[PDB]
Amino acid sequence: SLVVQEQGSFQHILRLLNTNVDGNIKIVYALTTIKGVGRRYSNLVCKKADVDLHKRAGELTQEELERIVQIMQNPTHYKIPAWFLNRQNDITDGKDYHTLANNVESKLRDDLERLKKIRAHRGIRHFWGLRVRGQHTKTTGRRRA
Amino acid sequence: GRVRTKTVKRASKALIERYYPKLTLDFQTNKRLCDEIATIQSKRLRNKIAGYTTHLMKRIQKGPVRG
């Protein structure tokens, strides 16, 4: 690239999606401070909104942002494969959704209490505050209870 | 740290005991002497046997020595 210097376009901090973001960090790495967002789920949507990531966050004049979220809140209507998201076939409607930062803490419990209400052994496990994926528990995970 | 075994040392003295006409002060000459004058079983073995006889015969031309 080359050196660039805007006048006042860069804003240090600006909240969105009920989360904060440092403007002094790159925007293809800043946005991943939200829940349900990853270093890859971000990269995909970034140039899909024809935005150049080479610059930081206080950059990227608002118009883009206003619908940058719309592309993730509506990830299938806007050309993204449905094997790239955290919630496919959900649990009761067969749809494919992406849950991002407030519903994720909720949806975790949604399935969690679902297995509990169903009495599934792994629900039992969770309720006991243990390892649910079958890993040996005698010699591991001792003091963080 | 390789002190030769007395197996070779016992042999070296027993040949210098009866072959001084022969047994020049050179190893290679002495080496090809054993294949014809001795019944050794291996190159390496006769190599230290002949290589030793040489040192003994190299010193006899300086003075006498036990054995």
Partner: protein, 143 residues
């Protein structure tokens, strides 16, 4: 004087092929190079993101030229690197099979590689005809 591909440095040459092929136009990208990480063993996709297909198609040819014939599998192993299986030891695995399988078709339709007999894909003859031309163009850097 008469140059050859071997007579040019690997990196500053395929990167010349990249700018050339990038600015040429006949690509036939499968359209899905927005996402693919290029291997299961890789953490994230390449950083060019407008390109890196020409950079891969740069050395995708360089290699096929220097050898008799090659196949999809061999390419996967070549670029494929070590994968940090988190807390488990690193291990090597082949790269993505389609990003290679049709990086060839995307470039054999352009005519720089032939589906060689005996199984595999040989450097095309016209691909062999643009052997030194691109090599020479890079010698023009230190003319």
């Amino acid at each position: 004087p008469g140059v050859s591909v071997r007579d040019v440095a690997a990196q500053d040459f395929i990167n010349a092929y990249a700018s050339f092929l990038q600015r040429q136009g006949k690509l036939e990208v499968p359209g899905y190079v927005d996402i693919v990480k290029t291997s299961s063993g890789n953490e994230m996709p390449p950083q060019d993101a407008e390109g890196w297909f020409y950079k891969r198609a740069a050395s995708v040819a360089r290699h096929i030229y220097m050898r008799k014939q090659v196949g999809v599998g061999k390419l996967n192993k070549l670029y494929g690197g070590a994968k940090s299986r988190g807390v488990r030891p690193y291990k090597h695995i082949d790269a993505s099979g389609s990003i290679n399988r049709k990086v060839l078709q995307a470039l054999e339709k352009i005519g720089i590689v032939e589906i060689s007999p005996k199984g595999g894909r040989r450097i095309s003859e016209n691909g062999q005809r643009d052997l030194d031309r691109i090599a020479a163009q890079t010698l023009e850097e230190d003319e």
